[PDB]
């Protein structure tokens, strides 16, 4: 194809730029296929994600375009970024395929979970997580679906976040990975249907940090009813001021619950699971967990405050924390509608950009 070349990836074809060689499958939808590749120009490994049937239906087309627009609002090192987007077709008439090039990491948090870890590597990872999360929130993007499989890391302890504002899925994480369900890490206000805000991802991070320490999922609910039980059996029944905010019927069910008493955070996370001067850290860490793993969103720690926390504060770098997003996501897009062909163009222009 003059500037492109075909390569057979399973039952699928990848027509990519010549600069990308040694293509090989590492994940698979459903909604797309991801290949690890070598970028000759950059001398650097990349992840090439080919969207599957972005023009199949009006819904797919909206997702394809929306995904492009989302990664436009982001310019942070702790978040996955679009290294390149392209199509092997020459005109809008025959345009049908879209390819997304992203940085290729070595791992996701799941493979970190089982590792022993110390305070400097743990607190650093969390710091990056909070840095990437703040950037998203600044761009007007609240993740909500933060889980160890959509958080990727490299061997040099660098961290990036995947799948912000994507359905599950839809996104990149579902198609590959040691996969994990999002149910375990969703905040109370989400699962209880109360609506949410920025610090909904603070809960998520809380669940992730708890798993890093205990090397086991904190709230493995068989379903959302069981999920709620797991949460309250360990953290206790939330104050009345919280429950009054619930919807009528659900409020009663949750008020119908057996009043469980919360285990103390030193009990949930005994120093046994922790590692001397570096025992002040175990205090610092456990404390932080008591602010993130809060049921009431009003009584939960903010992203900003979490950055200021002694266990995290050691890493504070204003360049890493205050880096503004290139653009803010206009939510008035979600309610916009177009035909498949109209969507096809908006996407096409974005690619040729």
């Amino acid at each position: 194809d003059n500037q492109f070349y075909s390569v057979e990836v399973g039952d699928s074809t990848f027509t990519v730029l010549k600069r990308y060689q040694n293509l090989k499958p590492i994940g698979s939808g459903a909604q797309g296929i991801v290949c690890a590749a070598y970028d000759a120009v950059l001398d650097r490994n990349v992840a090439i994600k080919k969207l599957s049937r972005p023009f199949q239906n009006q819904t797919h087309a909206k997702r394809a375009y929306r995904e492009l627009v989302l990664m436009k609002c982001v310019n942070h090192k702790n978040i996955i970024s679009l290294l390149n987007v392209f199509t092997p077709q020459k005109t809008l008439e025959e345009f049908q395929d879209v390819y997304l090039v992203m940085e290729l990491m070595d791992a996701n948090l799941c493979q970190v979970i089982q590792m022993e870890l110390d305070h400097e590597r743990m607190s650093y990872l969390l710091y990056q997580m909070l840095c990437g999360i703040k950037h998203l929130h600044s761009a007007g993007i609240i993740h909500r679906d933060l889980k160890p499989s959509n958080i990727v890391v490299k061997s040099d302890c660098t961290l990036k976040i995947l799948d912000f504002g994507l359905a599950r899925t839809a996104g990149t994480s579902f198609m590959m990975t040691p996969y994990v369900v999002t149910r375990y890490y969703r905040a109370p206000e989400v699962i209880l249907g109360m609506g949410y805000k920025e610090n909904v991802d603070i809960w998520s991070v809380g669940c992730i940090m708890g798993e890093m320490v205990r090397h086991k999922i904190l709230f493995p609910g068989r379903d959302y009813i069981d999920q709620w039980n797991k949460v309250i059996e360990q953290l206790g029944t939330p104050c009345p001021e919280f429950m009054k905010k619930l919807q009528p019927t659900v409020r009663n069910y949750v008020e119908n619950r057996p009043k469980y008493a919360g285990l103390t955070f030193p009990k949930l996370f005994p120093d046994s699971l922790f590692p001397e001067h570096n025992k002040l850290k175990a205090s610092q860490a456990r404390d932080l967990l008591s602010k993130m793993l809060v049921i009431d969103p009003a009584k939960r720690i903010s992203v900003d405050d979490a950055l200021q926390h002694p266990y995290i504060n050691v890493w504070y770098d204003p360049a890493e924390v205050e880096a503004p997003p290139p653009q803010i996501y206009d939510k008035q897009l979600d309610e916009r509608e177009h035909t498949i062909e109209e969507w096809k163009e908006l996407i096409y222009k974005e690619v040729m950009n």
């Binding site: 070595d106 400097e120 590597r121 302890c157």
Partner: peptide, 8 residues
């Protein structure tokens, strides 16, 4: 420091 590692 910032020059930490982690192995898989």
């Amino acid at each position: 420091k910032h020059e930490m590692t982690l192995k898989f």
